[PDB]
Amino acid sequence: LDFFTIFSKGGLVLWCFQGVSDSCTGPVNALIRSVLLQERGGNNSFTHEALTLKYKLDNQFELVFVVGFQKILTLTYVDKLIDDVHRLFRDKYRTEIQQQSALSLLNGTFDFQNDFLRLLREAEESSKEKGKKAPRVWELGGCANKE
């Protein structure tokens, strides 16, 4: 993985580890435009210009998970990793996300870096005229019996 973000429907980024590898100038804005207007529905389609991007929605807590890899071919473990990280987020950070108000989300701090790194290590280790013939005889059969 070379890019990964977890931001809410309110336009606030909760956690990311992009680093010097990638800069989130406008990689997710185009995806947002495609979701809002195009309504892609193409199973994680729409690579923007240089790297493939995939997304996952969470209507229960109004959240979206975005993962960006290079345009080079990548294995299918990315979707499994996304599902696992989403389930871990829902299991652990349920207290903040269940609250509708954004004040609790602002106040809370999430130290998800180590757990996500462990999940990434596990994923990388896994990656490494009907003619009717007949005869000249007749049939023979008997009958049943009853009371």
């Binding site: 429907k9 309110g10 336009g11 990311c16 997710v28 804005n29 979701v35 809002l36 109004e62 004040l103």
Partner: protein
């Protein structure tokens, strides 16, 4: 009661929403839904208001404005000063309908014009931005006098602000007039 934040895309609405509450810088993305939060003023009275931020995308601006203008007590329109000269028309067109939909209310709320991104030297002055807004809106009304906010029967103010402030967010936050205006209208 309620204060509604409006503006175009990448206008800093989320940053203004978060800085006035937490004061710590947070990475932000495009707003596609609404966000409402309760904020208590720093004065002795400690009045509690609700700040509501709506998406800046054109595809969802009206659908939420026409629904959230029923309980709005004040409105803050954020205008990007750094990139104003290349998008004069769009912000003026948005404000043209904003003014009509606000005047359609029973009670006229207060209006703030926050010229954001004032840290950059490219940012224009608030007075010049107001003059340009009047000049553009006079032509917008045509397409007997030039438009004047004094003639407009609203409590409109023009101020300068910046959320990130470029190099100004390392030690503090350059937001001083907004809180004073909120206290004055509180």
């Amino acid at each position: 009661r309620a204060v509604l934040l409006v503006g175009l895309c990448d206008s800093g609405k989320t940053l203004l929403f978060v800085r006035l509450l937490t004061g710590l810088y947070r990475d932000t993305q495009t707003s596609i839904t609404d966000s409402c939060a309760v904020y208590r003023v720093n004065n002795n009275r400690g009045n509690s208001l609700t700040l509501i931020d709506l998406p800046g995308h054109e595809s969802l601006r009206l659908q939420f404005l026409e629904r959230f203008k029923s309980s709005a007590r004040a409105i803050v329109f954020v205008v990007d000063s750094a990139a104003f000269q290349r998008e004069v028309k769009d912000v003026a067109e948005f404000l043209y309908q904003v003014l009509i939909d606000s005047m359609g209310l029973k009670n006229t709320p207060s209006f703030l014009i926050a010229c954001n991104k004032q840290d950059i030297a490219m940012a224009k002055s608030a007075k010049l931005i107001q003059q340009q807004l009047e000049k553009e809106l006079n032509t917008l009304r045509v397409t007997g006098k030039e438009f004047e906010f004094s003639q407009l029967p609203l409590k409109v103010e023009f101020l300068e602000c910046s959320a990130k402030g470029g190099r100004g967010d390392v030690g503090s936050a350059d937001i001083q007039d907004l809180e004073k205006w909120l206290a004055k209208i509180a």
